[PDB]
Design an enzyme around this catalytic site. Sequence first.
Site, PDB file in Angstrom:
ATOM      1  N   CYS B 105       0.860  -1.233   0.000  1.00 22.95           N
ATOM      2  CA  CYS B 105       0.000   0.000   0.000  1.00 22.95           C
ATOM      3  C   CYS B 105       0.881   1.263   0.000  1.00 22.95           C
ATOM      4  O   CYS B 105       1.471   1.603  -1.002  1.00 22.95           O
ATOM      5  CB  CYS B 105      -1.011  -0.110   1.146  1.00 22.95           C
ATOM      6  SG  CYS B 105      -1.685   1.430   1.832  1.00 22.95           S
ATOM      7  N   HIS B 125      -0.111   1.357  -3.525  1.00 20.38           N
ATOM      8  CA  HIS B 125      -1.455   1.873  -3.712  1.00 20.38           C
ATOM      9  C   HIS B 125      -1.431   2.858  -4.881  1.00 20.38           C
ATOM     10  O   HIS B 125      -0.475   3.618  -5.017  1.00 20.38           O
ATOM     11  CB  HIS B 125      -1.967   2.547  -2.442  1.00 20.38           C
ATOM     12  CG  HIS B 125      -3.436   2.734  -2.503  1.00 20.38           C
ATOM     13  ND1 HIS B 125      -4.020   3.826  -3.120  1.00 20.38           N
ATOM     14  CD2 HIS B 125      -4.437   1.903  -2.139  1.00 20.38           C
ATOM     15  CE1 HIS B 125      -5.331   3.678  -3.088  1.00 20.38           C
ATOM     16  NE2 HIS B 125      -5.609   2.504  -2.471  1.00 20.38           N
TER      17      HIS B 125
END
Lengths: 187, 187
Positions: B105, B125
């Site tokens: 992420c 992400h």
Amino acid sequence: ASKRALVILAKGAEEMETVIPVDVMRRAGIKVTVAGLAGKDPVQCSRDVVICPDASLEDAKKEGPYDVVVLPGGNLGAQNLSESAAVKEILKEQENRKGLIAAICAGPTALLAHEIGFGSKVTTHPLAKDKMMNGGHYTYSENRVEKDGLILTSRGPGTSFEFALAIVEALNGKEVAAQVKAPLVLK
Amino acid sequence: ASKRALVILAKGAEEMETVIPVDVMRRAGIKVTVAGLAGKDPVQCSRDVVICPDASLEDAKKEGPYDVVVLPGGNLGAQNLSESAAVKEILKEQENRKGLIAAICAGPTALLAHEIGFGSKVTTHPLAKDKMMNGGHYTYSENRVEKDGLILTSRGPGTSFEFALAIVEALNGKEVAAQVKAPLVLK
Ligand SMILES: [Cl-]
Ligand SMILES: [Cl-]
């Protein structure tokens, strides 16, 4: 007024089936209370992740009622929920006030134990099917998420996002669920 | 000898990206140490789930080395990891001993901060791409999971199972990953 969720956290709960719904519901703007079945002290989950409840279940019950009561799974978790008179009362009252009840994995077997939502179409973890279906008190479903009225069930860690988003959709609607979904990078 | 994982848990970590890898790795028989960046005290995550580390990072470092160092994401989590000299040292040493590093992420931006694995193909992400790619120190990838040598990256909460299972496969092989996968009810 924000919708409100009660997540009952017992020793041996499946930590993924606890955390994914709490996080996803909070992303949706639901006020979630993680309530420790055995008080406020940190709870050792099924794979030894230790989660600190926000409150004891005793105290959380006093701040009710909630728009949803959520039962995580895990073997020992579901057993602990199943044996709790305090949980029996909370679920009975929720069914009575026509509130949502959501259970995942072994979680639904606490519904069986407490005679909640008999006659409902339900799913469970595959390995919990025989336990859930003992006495023929429900109709079984293979759907990853099943919703029959105010009884929302799901199957396992891998259905936790779908389960959490079904709760969001039920409480807050499809548009909020789509919003919450967008940055999660789900398949 | 069981393989061993170090998961570094910072205030503001994404609790799903912490718990899914810890649980899945433990299901695989990996000995996981959840190490609190700021000691042994409970850690408040990005959506206010509170997780109790197994040990301080100080103490966990002494029980090293590990087969993988795992960096969860979350905005503040990744910022806290990025600012830690202690994390810089752990990652440098891991890259040196040719050990696996896995980040999800915003987690990979701590690799940027600590100048780890420059030249690697990485994912993040979507919302962390610009931050990660500032200075052109990596090649960007849109793959849900990316593995370039000993740098394993992933994109978000919704790729956490795939990320966790890629770590398992890397440490314990495909057969163990298939075993772990089987009861998860993944799609
Ligand atoms: Cl939409
Ligand atoms: Cl197989």
